[PDB]
Write a protein that binds this ligand. Structure first.
Ligand SMILES: *[C@@H]1O[C@H](CO)[C@@H](O)[C@H](O)[C@H]1NC(C)=O
Lengths: 50, 45
C-alpha cells in the first residue's frame, strides 16, 4: 500500500485490515508510512518508517 | 427537555470488517457528532 495523503489514521486502518484479513500489508508513502506505537499481535502490518 | 438533538443507533455486527463498513455507511452518512460504543455480552476482547 502507498498513499499520497498525510492522514495518519489510514495507517491504523491498514493494521486493522491485517488483523482480520490475515494478509500482509506494507506501507510505502504518505499515511501508510507513518509509524504507529503498537500494532495488534494478530495483525501482520509492516511499515517502512522509523 | 432539560435544556434540536437527534439520535441514532445500531447493533453490534459479528464481523469487525462488516461492523466498520456498517458504522460509516450508516452512522457517518447521517453526519453524527459522536458515537456511543459499548461491549457486547459475549467475552470478546
Ligand atoms: C433523526 O435520526 C433518525 C435515525 O434514523 C433519522 O431516521 C431521521 O431522518 C433523523 N431526523 C431528521 C429529521 O433528519
Amino acid at each position: 500500500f502507498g498513499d499520497d495523503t498525510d492522514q495518519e489514521a489510514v495507517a491504523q486502518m491498514l493494521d486493522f485490515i491485517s488483523s482480520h484479513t490475515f494478509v500482509p500489508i506494507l506501507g510505502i508513502h504518505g499515511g501508510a508510512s507513518m509509524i504507529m506505537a503498537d500494532k495488534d499481535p494478530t495483525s501482520t502490518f509492516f511499515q517502512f518508517g522509523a | 427537555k432539560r435544556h434540536q438533538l437527534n439520535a441514532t443507533s445500531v447493533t453490534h455486527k459479528p464481523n469487525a470488517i462488516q461492523m466498520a463498513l456498517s458504522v460509516c455507511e450508516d452512522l457517518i452518512s447521517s453526519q453524527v457528532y459522536a458515537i456511543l460504543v459499548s461491549h457486547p455480552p459475549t467475552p470478546n476482547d
